[PDB]
RNA sequence: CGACUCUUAGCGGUGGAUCACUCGGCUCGUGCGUCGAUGAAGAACGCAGCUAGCUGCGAGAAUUAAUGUGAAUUGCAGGACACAUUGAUCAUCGACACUUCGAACGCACUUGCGGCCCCGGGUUCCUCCCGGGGCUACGCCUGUCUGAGCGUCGCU
RNA sequence: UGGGUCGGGGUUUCGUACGUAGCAGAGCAGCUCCCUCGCUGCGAUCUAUUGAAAGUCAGCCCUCGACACAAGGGUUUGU
RNA sequence: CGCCGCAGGUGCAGAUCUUGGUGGUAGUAGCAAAUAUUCAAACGAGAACUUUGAAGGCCGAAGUGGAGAAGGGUUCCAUGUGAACAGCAGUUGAACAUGGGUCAGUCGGUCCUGAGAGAUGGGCGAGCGCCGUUCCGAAGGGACGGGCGAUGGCCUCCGUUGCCCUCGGCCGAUCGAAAGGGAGUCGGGUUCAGAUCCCCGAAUCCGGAGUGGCGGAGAUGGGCGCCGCGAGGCGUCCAGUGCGGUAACGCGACCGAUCCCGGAGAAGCCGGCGGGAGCCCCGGGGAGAGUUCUCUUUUCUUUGUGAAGGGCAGGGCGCCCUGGAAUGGGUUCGCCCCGAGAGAGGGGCCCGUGCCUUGGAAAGCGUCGCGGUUCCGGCGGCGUCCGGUGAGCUCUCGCUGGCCCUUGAAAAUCCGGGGGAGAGGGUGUAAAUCUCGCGCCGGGCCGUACCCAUAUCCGCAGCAGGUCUCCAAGGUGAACAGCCUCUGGCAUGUUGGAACAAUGUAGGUAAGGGAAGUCGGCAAGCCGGAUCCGUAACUUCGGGAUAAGGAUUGGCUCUAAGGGCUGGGUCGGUCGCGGCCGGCGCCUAGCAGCCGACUUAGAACUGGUGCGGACCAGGGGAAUCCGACUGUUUAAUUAAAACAAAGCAUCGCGAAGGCCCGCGGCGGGUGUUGACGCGAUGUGAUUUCUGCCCA
RNA sequence: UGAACUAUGCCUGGGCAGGGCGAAGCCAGAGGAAACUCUGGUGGAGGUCCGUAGCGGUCCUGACGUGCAAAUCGGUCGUC
């Protein structure tokens, strides 16, 4: 079998020295230095553990050269918060404001007595 | 090593350039008293300071 | 191929070659030799013939 | 008969004593008694036609100018040099010049990266790239400008 | 005449060579106008050829077979 | 040099005297660790050692192989020489001499912070200085915004400048990684020596563009009066900072500052599965070789497609919609999941290193030839094909678990969102604006050769020592074991020849006996793998345990068992020897065909009882002492019973504190701490006890 | 003046064949009137065991002892 060599002066199996095998048109196997595996954003809710959908999983400095659509979803908080927790926040905001109106009405009716 | 600084490389270059025999016409000068370069350094025998 | 001052960068070498030989150059590669002298490989533009330039310089 | 061994002598080796030499020291004495931000001492790197060291020198680099001197320098070569429309060499040294570190001074160095103001080029003035030049350390004195204070006051 | 070198024979050691053949062989895979109990393979092992094969003086024994070589070299020695 | 005086660093056999030189020893010890050389030829004065060829061997992929880090520093590469050196030689050399050689936006440094180091303020200090790193500082020198203005000019109008208003905590300079974080380069060719750097060809990241480079997006519609045969145009108004899907989310862009929120960077060790690749293996087809005494359609070699785009598989999803489940169901090797929404159906997203495609065959490779440009990226032909397997090995990606009184960085840097201060035009072939497509320009500085070790490093040396890593074939086998081999490498480790004495060093064997030897079974020997049986005391119930003990093991020929894929149709009743629906039938104890790994069990036959045939590979039992165990220790004479340990016990301390450092500062460590914590002791697991004495 | 060897703490990296035993958790079957028990699997824990590489250094009181070496070598070994 044809054995391999590193193509750079980094000789240790560190996290920045990771390779894959490639077969060139010259019918030889060489090392190709790979990029690190990217991660999709986590939700800003901090509660549900899954990572966001509709967004490419790339290294952070690659996001500078991506178009806007590839980095976010077409929704409020899109690309920053998950849909489920966005729905939860909408309902929570509406219902807490309704409860505020309830207590306002309650004190307004109760104040009729001196 | 392969990795070296510019100062180290320049120091090694000077030590390289002065490690050569005396010109043969030197010994024909008037009142020479010099026979051979006594400051010759071989890489395996004497190691450099740095 | 030239031996240049060790303190000169690629831009300086390119401009110097252009001015004092009346030629246009494409790129300059640069190394420093083990004896300490800087060596510059100056590739010429496609419309200039390095053979003719070396003949005019007198280094053939 | 020889070998071998010992003694002595002649010669030859090995070795570098002795002696003679001495552009070196040591000691005493005298006269001066002078470094540096206008960048020292010290260090580094360079510099000769052939040059590694020593010596000399600084990109004007084994030296420029100037003055004195007055035909060499020399190991080889080379070419100077009317010695008066000025001159080899050497000495002197007052002009000019004097790379990078270093108190070492834009920040930092076993690496490198700035900011401001001018100038030139690609621009074809507007601010990007390249190059050149000048600045940009700490402390402190005098003055200047800009300031702060429910510090002490005056007027409103 | 000589001693060698091969060869031969003897002795001895081990244990029955390769190849060939067998209606030998646990079986198995194919051929059945075939065959009338048959035919072609793979198959450890067995049997015969075959006390065979191989070695044997290099410090074994005898050759009178073959082959070439052998009055040659150097240093000394005297009452 | 003598004599008269003067003055001393003034007389050597010794001091294990100092420095230098030279003997005997002595042509002696020695040139003995890692299996090994041989034949012929060439060059040459000269060959055991150099070179070529042939042979026989070794390293045997955890290498004597191919590449790096540190260190060395020219040892690298040619040419020449034969002084000295290479402990023999040398025609050779890592020697000597003369020349040559290291080419980068995308490989690093450079940037970031880490443990830490370290100025300033302040404090101390006789003083050089040192303490301290947010502490006892007026520590923001910046900003699209607005205003006051100088109009500096292609003075239309926007860029400039000074001042003012508003906003503005990395709250701490700076340094600290060639293995951490960190955008973006690959394929082919090329040298005597350099290449991811040169050349060729394909890309790509970042930065810039004032006068705006081209497009595309924004964005060009609606109403009403009209003209006009109508279409199509005219005029007044009105919108217009994009659109789609129930949703997950999608589309090529998709205005928006100060400010706020979040993400990525950004995470441990171990287990088990699954996907992908490279390698290995199997069956064919080619091309070239090997064997051919006989056989073998045989044996060996070889039989490509980079990055970056596009499409499609494949993998994953704790993503969505319908719906509502017990006779619970789904499902993994293990688990695990579900009225907080299972199963089922249909979608969405992510990764896509795999396949196809652009690249791309033009290159490369293998072969067969023909021309030469002393040494052409020559020319030409042909080929670069089809399949199958898997608890295989190595990478990688993913899923799901376990462990922790252990929870496994930081910061540069980049991005998304919330908000809506503002900006842009009056319906124009429009504006502000644009993370969309294409186009234009630039990327400086330093390193880069080679060795990386039984000869380029350190050990005084070409020293059996030491010195951080990556790649990793076939057979046997449980195996990265040992043994043999292929690729690649080498010449036996600083000499050869001839003998084969003693004594040695290393390795074997030995009748009969079997520890009688010796301080002592020291040393050696015995045993050993796997399968099937079978295993005691004691015990902290886990162990002891491979206890002990016994049987078997080869070769050959079979036999059973253990799987995966496809196809199960009763009919021309008709025509798109084929297809839309239906009178038209019962595999429902499942078959039919094909394909493919090993593994197990049983049986027969067979050999001179030999079979884990080499290699690999526990002797066992009964007790006593000590230490609980695992761990550590006197580098270079002691590995132990010593130290440590968990457990137990005691002591101090509530911060103006305990313990400790400090020359000094209300300085500093514990302490980013707070009694379940720090600090100081003793004893030493468990079990069981731990008595008396305070003179 | 030294932590280039060593000792210890911290930071940031890299590495450790092949087998044995078989902890919890889980499945099923069997026995019982129950309570529950037994059996076979599955699983893969552990400062677990045999044993490579690595790390160490027990014995031969082996070699060597003007050595290869101012501490090395061989076999046997401890842990893995
Ligand atoms: Mg590919
Ligand atoms: Mg050395
Ligand atoms: Mg370079
Ligand atoms: Mg004499
Ligand atoms: Mg002069
Ligand atoms: Mg640095
Ligand atoms: Mg006042
Ligand atoms: Mg005979
Ligand atoms: Mg004396
Ligand atoms: Mg004497
Ligand atoms: Mg005496
Ligand atoms: Mg001898
Ligand atoms: Mg010897
Ligand atoms: Mg071998
Ligand atoms: Mg190697
Ligand atoms: Mg010699
Ligand atoms: Mg060489
Ligand atoms: Mg040399
Ligand atoms: Mg601040
Ligand atoms: Mg830094
Ligand atoms: Mg890194
Ligand atoms: Mg190379
Ligand atoms: Mg392709
Ligand atoms: Mg479902
Ligand atoms: Mg082709
Ligand atoms: Mg290299
Ligand atoms: Mg060595
Ligand atoms: Mg030394
Ligand atoms: Mg050697
Ligand atoms: Mg040998
Ligand atoms: Mg030899
Ligand atoms: Mg016996
Ligand atoms: Mg016996
Ligand atoms: Mg006895
Ligand atoms: Mg006795
Ligand atoms: Mg023993
Ligand atoms: Mg026992
Ligand atoms: Mg049998
Ligand atoms: Mg113990
Ligand atoms: Mg105990
Ligand atoms: Mg120890
Ligand atoms: Mg010891
Ligand atoms: Mg010991
Ligand atoms: Mg106890
Ligand atoms: Mg204790
Ligand atoms: Mg008492
Ligand atoms: Mg250290
Ligand atoms: Mg263990
Ligand atoms: Mg063990
Ligand atoms: Mg001994
Ligand atoms: Zn959420």
Swiss-Prot record, chain A:
Pfam family membership, one: Ribosomal_L34e
Position(s), cross-link Glycyl lysine isopeptide (Lys-Gly) (interchain with G-Cter in SUMO2): 107
Single GO molecular function: structural constituent of ribosome
Residues found modified as Phosphoserine: 11
Modified residues (N6-acetyllysine): 35, 42
Keyword Glycoprotein assigned: no
Keyword check for Ubl conjugation: yes
GO biological process, one term: cytoplasmic translation
InterPro entries from the UniProt entry: Ribosomal_eL34, Ribosomal_eL34_C_sf, Ribosomal_eL34_CS
Chain segments annotated as transmembrane: none
Functional note: Component of the large ribosomal subunit. The ribosome is a large ribonucleoprotein complex responsible for the synthesis of proteins in the cell.
Family: Belongs to the eukaryotic ribosomal protein eL34 family.
UniProt-listed PANTHER family: 60S RIBOSOMAL PROTEIN L34
Subunit structure: Component of the large ribosomal subunit.
Protein's name in the database: Large ribosomal subunit protein eL34
UniProt lineage: Eukaryota, Metazoa, Chordata, Craniata, Vertebrata
Swiss-Prot record, chain B:
GO molecular function: RNA binding; structural constituent of ribosome
Principal place of residence: cytoplasm
GO cellular component entries: cytosol; cytosolic large ribosomal subunit; cytosolic ribosome; extracellular space
DNA repair recorded as keyword: no
Keywords tagged on the record: Cytoplasm, Ribonucleoprotein, Ribosomal protein
Keyword match Ribonucleoprotein: yes
PROSITE patterns hit by this protein: RIBOSOMAL_L39E
HAMAP family the record matches: Ribosomal_eL39
Family designation: Belongs to the eukaryotic ribosomal protein eL39 family.
Subunit record text: Component of the large ribosomal subunit. Interacts with IMPACT.
Role according to the record: RNA-binding component of the large ribosomal subunit. The ribosome is a large ribonucleoprotein complex responsible for the synthesis of proteins in the cell.
Name this polypeptide is given: Large ribosomal subunit protein eL39
UniProtKB/Swiss-Prot annotation, chain C:
Post-translational modification: N-terminus is methylated by METTL11A/NTM1. Citrullinated by PADI4.
Record's keyword annotation contains DNA damage: no
KW Ubl conjugation (keyword) present: yes
Induction: May be down-regulated by GNL2 (at protein level).
A Gene Ontology biological process term: cytoplasmic translation
Primary localisation category: cytoplasm
Effect of residue 3 to T: Found in Diamond-Blackfan anemia patients; uncertain significance
One MF term in the entry's GO annotations: rRNA binding
Cellular component, GO annotation: cytoplasm; cytosol; cytosolic large ribosomal subunit; cytosolic ribosome; extracellular exosome; nucleolus; nucleus
Disulphide linkage map: none
Keywords for the protein's UniProt record, in alphabetical order: Acetylation, Citrullination, Cytoplasm, Isopeptide bond, Methylation, Nucleus, Phosphoprotein, Ribonucleoprotein, Ribosomal protein, RNA-binding, rRNA-binding, Ubl conjugation
Locations listed in the record: Cytoplasm; Nucleus
Recorded family membership: Belongs to the universal ribosomal protein uL23 family.
Subunit text: Component of the large ribosomal subunit. Interacts with LYAR and GNL2. Interacts with MDM2; this interaction may promote MDM2-mediated p53/TP53 polyubiquitination. Directly interacts (via BIB domain) with IPO5, IPO7, KPNB1 and TNPO1; these interactions are involved in RPL23A nuclear import for the assembly of ribosomal subunits. Interacts with IPO8.
Domain notes: The N-terminal beta-like import receptor binding (BIB) domain mediates interaction with IPO5, IPO7, KPNB1 and TNPO1.
Function: Component of the large ribosomal subunit. The ribosome is a large ribonucleoprotein complex responsible for the synthesis of proteins in the cell. Binds a specific region on the 26S rRNA. May promote p53/TP53 degradation possibly through the stimulation of MDM2-mediated TP53 polyubiquitination.
Protein name per the record: Large ribosomal subunit protein uL23
Organism of origin: Homo sapiens (Human)
């Amino acid at each position: 079998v044809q054995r391999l060599t590193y193509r750079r002066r980094l000789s240790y199996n560190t996290a920045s020295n990771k390779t894959r095998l490639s077969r060139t048109p010259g019918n030889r196997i060489v090392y190709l230095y790979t990029k690190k595996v990217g991660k999709a954003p986590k939700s800003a809710c901090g509660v549900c553990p899954g990572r966001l959908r509709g967004v490419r999983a790339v290294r952070p400095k690659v996001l500078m050269r991506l178009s806007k659509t590839k980095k976010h979803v077409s929704r409020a908080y899109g690309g920053s918060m998950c849909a489920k927790c966005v729905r939860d926040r909408i309902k929570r905001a509406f219902l807490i404001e309704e409860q505020k109106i309830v207590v306002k009405v309650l004190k307004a009716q109760a104040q009729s007595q001196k | 090593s392969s990795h070296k600084t510019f100062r180290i490389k320049r120091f090694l270059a000077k030590k390289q350039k002065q490690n050569r025999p005396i010109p043969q016409w030197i010994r024909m000068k008037t009142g020479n008293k010099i026979r051979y370069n006594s400051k010759r350094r071989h890489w395996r025998r004497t190691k450099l300071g740095l | 191929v030239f031996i240049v001052d060790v303190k000169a960068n690629k831009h300086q070498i390119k401009q110097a070659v252009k001015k004092l030989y009346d030629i246009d150059v494409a790129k300059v590669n640069t190394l420093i030799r083990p004896d300490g002298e800087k060596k510059a490989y100056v590739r010429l533009a496609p419309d200039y013939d390095a053979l003719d330039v070396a003949n005019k310089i007198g280094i053939i």
